[PDB]
Amino acid sequence: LDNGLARTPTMGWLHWERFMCNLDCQEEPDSCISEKLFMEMAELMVSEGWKDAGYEYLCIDDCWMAPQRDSEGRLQADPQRFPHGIRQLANYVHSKGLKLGIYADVGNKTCAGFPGSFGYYDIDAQTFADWGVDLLKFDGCYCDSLENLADGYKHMSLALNRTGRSIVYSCEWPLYMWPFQKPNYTEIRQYCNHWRNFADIDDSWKSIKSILDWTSFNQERIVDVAGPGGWNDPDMLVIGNFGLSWNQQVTQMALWAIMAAPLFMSNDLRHISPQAKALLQDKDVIAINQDPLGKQGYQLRQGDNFEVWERPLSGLAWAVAMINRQEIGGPRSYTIAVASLGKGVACNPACFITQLLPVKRKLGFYEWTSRLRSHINPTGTVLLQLENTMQM
Amino acid sequence: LDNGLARTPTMGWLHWERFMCNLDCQEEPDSCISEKLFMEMAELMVSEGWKDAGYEYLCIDDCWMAPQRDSEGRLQADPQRFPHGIRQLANYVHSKGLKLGIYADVGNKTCAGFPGSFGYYDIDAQTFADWGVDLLKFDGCYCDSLENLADGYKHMSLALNRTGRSIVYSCEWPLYMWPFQKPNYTEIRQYCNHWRNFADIDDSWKSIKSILDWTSFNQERIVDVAGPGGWNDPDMLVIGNFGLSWNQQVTQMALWAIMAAPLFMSNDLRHISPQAKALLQDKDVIAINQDPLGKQGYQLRQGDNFEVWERPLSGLAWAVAMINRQEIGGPRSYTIAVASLGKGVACNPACFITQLLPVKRKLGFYEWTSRLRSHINPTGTVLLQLENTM
Ligand SMILES: *[C@@H]1O[C@H](CO)[C@@H](O[C@@H]2O[C@H](CO)[C@@H](O[C@@H]3O[C@H](CO)[C@@H](O)[C@H](O[C@H]4O[C@H](CO)[C@@H](O)[C@H](O)[C@@H]4O)[C@@H]3O)[C@H](O)[C@H]2NC(C)=O)[C@H](O)[C@H]1NC(C)=O
Ligand SMILES: *[C@@H]1O[C@H](CO)[C@@H](O[C@@H]2O[C@H](CO)[C@@H](O[C@@H]3O[C@H](CO)[C@@H](O)[C@H](O[C@H]4O[C@H](CO)[C@@H](O)[C@H](O)[C@@H]4O)[C@@H]3O)[C@H](O)[C@H]2NC(C)=O)[C@H](O)[C@H]1NC(C)=O
Ligand SMILES: *[C@@H]1O[C@H](CO)[C@@H](O[C@@H]2O[C@H](CO)[C@@H](O)[C@H](O)[C@H]2NC(C)=O)[C@H](O)[C@H]1NC(C)=O
Numbered sequence: 001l002d003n004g005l006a007r008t009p010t011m012g013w014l015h016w017e018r019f020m021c022n023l024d025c026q027e028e029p030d031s032c033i034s035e036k037l038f039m040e041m042a043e044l045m046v047s048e049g050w051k052d053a054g055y056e057y058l059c060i061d062d063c064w065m066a067p068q069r070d071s072e073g074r075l076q077a078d079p080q081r082f083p084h085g086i087r088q089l090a091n092y093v094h095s096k097g098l099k100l101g102i103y104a105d106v107g108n109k110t111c112a113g114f115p116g117s118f119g120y121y122d123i124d125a126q127t128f129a130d131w132g133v134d135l136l137k138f139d140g141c142y143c144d145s146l147e148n149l150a151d152g153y154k155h156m157s158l159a160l161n162r163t164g165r166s167i168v169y170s171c172e173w174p175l176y177m178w179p180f181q182k183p184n185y186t187e188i189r190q191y192c193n194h195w196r197n198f199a200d201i202d203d204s205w206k207s208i209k210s211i212l213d214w215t216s217f218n219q220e221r222i223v224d225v226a227g228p229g230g231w232n233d234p235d236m237l238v239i240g241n242f243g244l245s246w247n248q249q250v251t252q253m254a255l256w257a258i259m260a261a262p263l264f265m266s267n268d269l270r271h272i273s274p275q276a277k278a279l280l281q282d283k284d285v286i287a288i289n290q291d292p293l294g295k296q297g298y299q300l301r302q303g304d305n306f307e308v309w310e311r312p313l314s315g316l317a318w319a320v321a322m323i324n325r326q327e328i329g330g331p332r333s334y335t336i337a338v339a340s341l342g343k344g345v346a347c348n349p350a351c352f353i354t355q356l357l358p359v360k361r362k363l364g365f366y367e368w369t370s371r372l373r374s375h376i377n378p379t380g381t382v383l384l385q386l387e388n389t390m391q392m
Numbered sequence: 393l394d395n396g397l398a399r400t401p402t403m404g405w406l407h408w409e410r411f412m413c414n415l416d417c418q419e420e421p422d423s424c425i426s427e428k429l430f431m432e433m434a435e436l437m438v439s440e441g442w443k444d445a446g447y448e449y450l451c452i453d454d455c456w457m458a459p460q461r462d463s464e465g466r467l468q469a470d471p472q473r474f475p476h477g478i479r480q481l482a483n484y485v486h487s488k489g490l491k492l493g494i495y496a497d498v499g500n501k502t503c504a505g506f507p508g509s510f511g512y513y514d515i516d517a518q519t520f521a522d523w524g525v526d527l528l529k530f531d532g533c534y535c536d537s538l539e540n541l542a543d544g545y546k547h548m549s550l551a552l553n554r555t556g557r558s559i560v561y562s563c564e565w566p567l568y569m570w571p572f573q574k575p576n577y578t579e580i581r582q583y584c585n586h587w588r589n590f591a592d593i594d595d596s597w598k599s600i601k602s603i604l605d606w607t608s609f610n611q612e613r614i615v616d617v618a619g620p621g622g623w624n625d626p627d628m629l630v631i632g633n634f635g636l637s638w639n640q641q642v643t644q645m646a647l648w649a650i651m652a653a654p655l656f657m658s659n660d661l662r663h664i665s666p667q668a669k670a671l672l673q674d675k676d677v678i679a680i681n682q683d684p685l686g687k688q689g690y691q692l693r694q695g696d697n698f699e700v701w702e703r704p705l706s707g708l709a710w711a712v713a714m715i716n717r718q719e720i721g722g723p724r725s726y727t728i729a730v731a732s733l734g735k736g737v738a739c740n741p742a743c744f745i746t747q748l749l750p751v752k753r754k755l756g757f758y759e760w761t762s763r764l765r766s767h768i769n770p771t772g773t774v775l776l777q778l779e780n781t782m
């Protein structure tokens with residue numbers, strides 16, 4: 001989408017995976033979807049260094065709406081859980097230096113059953129803009145036809161444009177096309193800043209594996225589509241929650257960097273380990289994800305329960321990720337000729353190699369003919385950065 | 393098995409899950425299966441508090457053997473990887489106040505292809521006794537009939553007895569029989585100190601779930617046969633390795649205590665986090681596992697992606713575990729009438745309840761009328777101990 005936005009993948013926080021559609025503020029007040037949750041989350045985004053690291057968008061997902069539109073046919077926030085309204089929330093979020101994301105649905109209802117946007121595309125776009133919304137995630141439930149789906153996504157893109165407000169447009173269009181026909185990603189890219197391709201992540205290594213395997217299986221179809229202004233969205237970061245081991249968290253962070261994924265954390269910033277916070281705030285890995293060239297990486301090799309992925313970076317640099325998919329035993333040795341990496345460009349005539357994950361350590365100069373040897377933990381990833389050089 | 397051993401579930405360390413059949417001492421000298429690996433583990437078991445916590449059996453799994461028997465037809469350890477031989481390693485381990493476990497196979501080869509014990513059961517038992525072995529894990533590969541399987545497990549049990557040395561006898565008899573015939577656990581218990589029931593564990597939450605689900609599905613057949621001298625073995629503890637989140641590690645420790653499982657760690661004692669060490673050494677949870685009554689716990693309830701398990705303990709106490717199997721969202725609320733716990737006696741007229749996992753915290757007195765409410769992390773477990781006030 002050519003709106004000047006998302007020139008690097010968008011970074012922020014989105015409530016869905018960790019908080020879902022919890023409406024019971026009486027018995028579960030700390031996890032119900034409420035304006036207080038987002039206000040406190042904004043405070044922590046500032047005070048715990050998230051904003052500084054690049055996480056700028058504080059995003060509301062489904063279940064913020066009142067059950068029905070107001071007298072003027074406009075959407076309203078739930079009166080009990082959002083009594084002060086979205087415009088006041090956005091004012092608060094902006095006063096913290098952050099940006100506010102909201103959610104809506106292309107069809108007659110949101111996936112959780114709340115008012116849908118079909119018939120109100122321009123009204124809803126203008127409403128969000130008046131409120132100060134800076135990002136829209138547009139879901140695909142309750143759409144009567146493929147034609148409705150595509151028309152609605154295009155219409156909402158145009159209607160947001162007409163407001164004159166800069167609004168990141170996050171689409172689930174390709175995901176909801178798969179029951180019927182395969183997506184045309186040139187069109188989607190025309191209308192969307194990023195798009196969900198695959199099933200929702202949950203708090204499990206099984207889910208990470210499913211997402212990565214779908215992505216690498218489909219990579220000839222999606223990798224080259226991505227670039228500044230339009231990204232593939234493999235769904236939220238779930239680091240900091242409950243179901244991933246440390247090595248599985250490292251794998252998610254590394255591979256979302258490789259994939260030029262939007263980085264939307266879905267966790268509870270009020271209750272997050274120092275290890276998870278340091279990984280999510282890792283400056284060198286975020287710099288890979290945010291590389292200005294904006295070319296998505298890919299799976300280079302797979303075999304013997306190993307994977308090698310790589311991503312071309314600005315200035316003849318490359319990121320390389322090695323995944324050990326064997327889920328038994330200990331760290332496994334993996335060796336590769338550096339000439340096989342980065343299309344034989346990364347280390348011609350030499351490269352300086354820095355390991356970034358699981359721990360940061362300089363590995364040194366590797367000439368074009370040399371071999372790189374690593375050990376990778378089960379379900380873990382070694383992430384390396386290669387800097388092309390003439391020196392040594 | 394009435395040999396006076398395994399009166400509580402055996403506790404120790406077993407190389408297989410973490411170190412497997414790594415024979416490459418040239419390129420991986422610190423991880424290959426060798427005498428040096430077991431000496432290093434023995435030293436740390438003493439110096440890092442594992443033995444004090446109760447972990448006593450340092451166990452060798454498959455791939456210790458030389459490719460062939462010796463001139464006299466006996467098993468021998470690999471001459472390069474075990475240059476001083478098993479008897480000498482057992483001497484060292486005994487000098488640390490520990491016990492040594494070894495591995496053999498009822499069939500013609502071990503699962504990894506080394507010499508099997510079929511046709512050599514008495515020689516092999518006497519060899520192990522002469523070496524000072526304290527425990528035998530007896531695998532089931534390369535056995536061509538259910539009759540040979542059964543007769544081999546019984547024959548080795550008897551041959552061990554006949555040596556006169558006390559040797560814990562760990563069998564895989566049910567696991568290898570189950571595809572073809574339902575095992576008779578009364579008979580198995582007669583011949584074995586503990587027995588593997590289900591597929592090998594690996595370093596994954598998926599494996600833990602599979603083991604728990606098989607155990608609760610089969611619990612009417614296996615729970616009552618367990619007790620002092622004879623335990624169900626749901627396989628190694630893999631806490632401290634790579635594949636489990638903290639809450640999944642908590643779930644494994646809590647449920648292996650509920651199940652009166654043997655506690656064979658398979659990890660790298662040289663490289664283990666302080667938090668994994670503290671969980672594996674948790675005195676209150678080990679005390680539940682090691683409860684002298686030796687009554688195996690069981691699944692009480694399942695529904696809404698929660699499970700409740702409980703275990704009766706000595707002196708009117710009970711342990712209760714609540715598992716959250718929903719793998720999305722946040723800590724999820726579960727409540728249960730305490731009159732539903734411990735068959736209705738745990739908290740009649742009242743009980744004091746202490747949470748042990750994920751953190752220790754006294755919850756207070758609960759009357760017979762009360763309800764217990766808790767939030768359980770996704771894939772995590774809350775483990776409680778209830779003491780009747782009477
Ligand atoms: C509504 O839609 C219209 C188009 O459909 C959209 O305007 C388009 O997008 C951007 C607006 O920022 C324009 O692209 C810029 O064009 C100028 C003209 O030369 C360039 O100098 C700009 O380059 C800078 O920014 C780029 C990032 O966008 C960098 O890559 C670059 O290196 C420079 O730093 C940039 O290309 C584009 O020309 C228009 N197209 C039109 C007007 O036809 C508009 O923004 C949308 N409105 C809203 C509110 O979303
Ligand atoms: C070979 O097989 C035989 C037959 O199965 C086996 O003999 C059994 O040994 C056990 C333990 O040595 C005996 O059980 C003991 O019986 C005596 C009876 O005098 C009891 O005093 C023992 O009590 C122990 O536990 C008490 C609490 O329960 C404690 O006070 C104390 O710690 C006691 O040690 C215990 O119940 C069993 O009677 C015999 N059975 C027969 C038929 O002899 C033998 O051990 C096996 N040998 C080898 C080398 O495996
Ligand atoms: C399971 O095995 C046990 C022992 O092999 C059987 O129990 C024995 O049965 C005989 C005759 O019925 C008795 O004389 C023994 O005293 C029993 N031993 C014990 C320890 O109880 C049992 O019958 C077998 N069950 C099945 C279903 O085959």
Ligand SMILES: *[C@@H]1O[C@H](CO)[C@@H](O)[C@H](O)[C@H]1NC(C)=O
Nearest residue numbers: 183184185186187188189190
């Ligand atoms: C996809 O859509 C774009 C824009 O409408 C169009 O130019 C392109 O030809 C389409 N691709 C196919 C295969 O139809």
Ligand SMILES: *[C@@H]1O[C@H](CO)[C@@H](O)[C@H](O)[C@H]1NC(C)=O
Nearest residue numbers: 499500510534535536537540
């Ligand atoms: C071992 O091999 C012999 C020779 O083929 C065979 O007769 C015997 O049944 C085998 N034993 C087992 C337990 O498979």
Ligand SMILES: CN1[C@H](CO)[C@H](O)[C@H](O)[C@H]1CO
Nearest residue numbers: 016061062111112139172200
């Ligand atoms: C079902 N919706 C949910 C809101 O109800 C989340 O936004 C999810 O990402 C989407 C499915 O893709």
Ligand SMILES: CN1[C@H](CO)[C@H](O)[C@H](O)[C@H]1CO
Nearest residue numbers: 408453454503504531564592
């Ligand atoms: C295949 N063997 C392996 C040794 O080869 C491990 O002992 C495993 O526990 C058993 C199967 O249950």
